[PDB]
Amino acid sequence: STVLSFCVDAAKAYKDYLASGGQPITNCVKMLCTHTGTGQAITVTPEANMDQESFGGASCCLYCRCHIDHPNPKGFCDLKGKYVQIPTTCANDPVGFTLKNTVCTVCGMWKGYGCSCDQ
């Protein structure tokens, strides 16, 4: 409880690092792909559309890249072993994008970057 109560919050700490002009985490692995994919956020294979870039999941995960526990009772990673689609306009900071945005449980598209379930 005292270790859990104390624990880190690496998520907000990254936005603060970027806010203070910190260089975004590099070496996210960009894949070669057709760019005619479904455009869904996190997929078993690259699914980038004409407006996205596909990256190896583990390399875009703050917790994987910083070697720190994942925020989940099971410590399950949502990116590792998968491919994350990042809008070309945000492709310079894939770690920042996956942290700041959430996936739509219904259509699998990024909320605010592909999900149109709300009209």
Binding site: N27, T45, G56, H67
Partner: protein, 299 residues
């Protein structure tokens, strides 16, 4: 641009394999030159993409629940670009295990950190990829002789852990090579030394063994074959090219559902060898995949 510029790379032509050259120093006309890669694409993503594009033209065995192990998967970046490409290429659900002397984060199902000699497994594999390279290889002080180190482990791993019908792609260079590994290429239905077009300016090649037969099909002298490889590279300049990276429509490995069967060594007849030689058969048990990393206990 030559016809080979639209290919993912160039394989060592058969007539060069049949020579008896003496080892000479490798001297590439474009040595060091860097390829013009698509924007933001890493050299190792391009290299592995071209290797996979070339493996798509071979008779690889592709069984359900395929088993692939990738040695030398880590980079100085702390990530695994090659593993990302292999997982993109391999059918979904393929068990992909990777390893490296140094720590790194990977998309592999399981990752083992430590010298490849500390990696153990009773299970057999369908495909072995090695990108291992000893940094000390750059220290060229003595004659260019057959190298041991990880090559000794790779040869033993192929002999004891590769399923019959399985294939391998093992990275070599002018100075990073092993005579026994070349001799082992003679235990496959077919083999070659493949050069990626994005790294045409390097002596690097992938030694590819296609469909393991577990017995010699042809006798290969490793010292002579490496000399033949360098003669080929020294007399056939390859123009740097990234052209094949732009068409990824047929990139994924075709799921062939290759049959997997258990057979005693006495049951391996000519009809079975014929099936192995066409990528239509994998011989191994279908038991649970268990791997381990030896840990040295010290004060």
């Amino acid at each position: 641009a030559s016809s080979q510029a639209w290919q993912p790379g160039v394989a060592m032509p058969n007539l060069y394999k049949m020579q008896r050259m003496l080892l000479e120093k490798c001297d590439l006309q474009n040595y060091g030159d860097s390829a013009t890669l698509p924007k933001g694409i890493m050299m190792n993503v391009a290299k592995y993409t071209q290797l996979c594009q070339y493996l798509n033209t071979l008779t690889l065995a592709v069984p359900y629940n395929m088993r692939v192990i990738h040695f030398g998967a880590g980079s100085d970046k702390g990530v695994a670009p090659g593993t990302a490409v292999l997982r993109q290429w391999l059918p979904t659900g393929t068990l992909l295990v990777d390893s490296d002397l140094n720590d790194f984060v990977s998309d592999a199902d399981s990752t083992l950190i430590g010298d490849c000699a500390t990696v153990h497994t009773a299970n057999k594999w369908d495909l072995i990829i090695s990108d291992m390279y000893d940094p000390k290889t750059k220290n060229v002080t003595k004659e260019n002789d057959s190298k041991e180190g990880f090559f000794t482990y790779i040869c033993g791993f192929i002999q004891q852990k590769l399923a019959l019908g399985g294939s391998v792609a093992i990275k070599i260079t002018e100075h990073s090579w092993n005579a026994d590994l070349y001799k082992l290429m003679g235990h496959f239905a077919w083999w070659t030394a493949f050069v990626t077009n994005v790294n045409a300016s390097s002596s690097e090649a992938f030694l590819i063994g296609c469909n393991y037969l577990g017995k010699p099909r042809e006798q290969i002298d490793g010292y002579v074959m490496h000399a033949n490889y360098i003669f080929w590279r020294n007399t056939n300049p390859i123009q740097l090219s990234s052209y094949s990276l732009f068409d990824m429509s047929k990139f994924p490995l075709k799921l062939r559902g290759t049959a997997v069967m258990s057979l005693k060594e006495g049951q391996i007849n000519d009809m079975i060898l014929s099936l192995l030689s066409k990528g239509r058969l994998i011989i191994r048990e279908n038991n649970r995949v268990v791997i381990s990393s030896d840990v040295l206990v010290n004060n």
